[PDB]
Amino acid sequence: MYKHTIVYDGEVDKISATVVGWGYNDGKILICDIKDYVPGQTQNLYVVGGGACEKISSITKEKFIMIKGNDRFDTLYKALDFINR
Amino acid sequence: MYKHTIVYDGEVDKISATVVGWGYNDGKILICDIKDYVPGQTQNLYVVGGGACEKISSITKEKFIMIKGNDRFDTLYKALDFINR
């Protein structure tokens, strides 16, 4: 169903998650809160921000890439770095 | 009356406008689409993105600061720079 799914927890980390999705235009992408994440329907899973990174392993067995800093700003810079922007 | 109002045009410049809002916790803040902007109820006006920056002068006669780059990423970095992050 999706090529890239980017998960976050909360309206702050949503920003960073959204910017990670700005790095991809090669397929269908889903940006969604961890509380709405449905496992098993994505090729790639990216988890953004500390909150989502602590909860994700209890929600899915899929492999994933973590994008996380110490605060909302650091996370945002790491997101930008991850997509080479 | 709002201490800070941040205006944007569209869901992409919304993201940078949200980031500018992360820089302010000293007062009441409105983040809103340029279509919904109501002049005369803010101490500080900040206009995010090329879209809003072209429409705003025909909507209000208030002074404002422009936060805009050539693409969405440039706009986002300028948002971060505007709040010293």
Author numbering:
A (entry chain F), B (entry chain A): 186 to 270
List sentences from the manuscript:
It was found that the “full length” construct had been proteolyzed and the crystal contained six copies of the C-terminal portion of CD27L alone. The refined structure shows clear electron density for all six monomers of the C-terminal domain with a Matthews coefficient of 2.3, and there is no space in the crystal lattice for an additional N-terminal domain. The autolytic fragment of the C-terminal domain starts at the end of the linker at methionine M186, which is still integrated in the C-terminal domain. The dimerization is such that the N-termini of both monomers are pointing away from the dimer interface, and we term this dimerization mode a ‘head-on’ dimer. An alternative dimerization mode is found among the six C-terminal domains present in the crystal structure of the proteolytic fragment of CD27L endolysin, between two molecules that are each involved in separate head-on dimers as well.
Here, we present the crystal structures of autoproteolytic fragments of the CD27L and CTP1L endolysins, covering the C-terminal domain. We propose that the cleavage and oligomerization are linked, and they provide the endolysin with a trigger and release mechanism that leads to activation.
